[PDB]
Amino acid sequence: AQYEDGKQYTTLEKPVAGAPQVLEFFSFFCPHCYQFEEVLHISDNVKKKLPEGVKMTKYHVNFMGGDLGKDLTQAWAVAMALGVEDKVTVPLFEGVQKTQTIRSASDIRDVFINAGIKGEEYDAAWNSFVVKSLVAQQEKAAADVQLRGVPAMFVNGKYQLNPQGMDTSNMDVFVQQYADTVKYLSEK
Question: Which of 25, 28, 59, 121 could cross-link with 96 by S-S, CB 3.0 to 4.6 Å?
Answer without folding.
Answer: 28
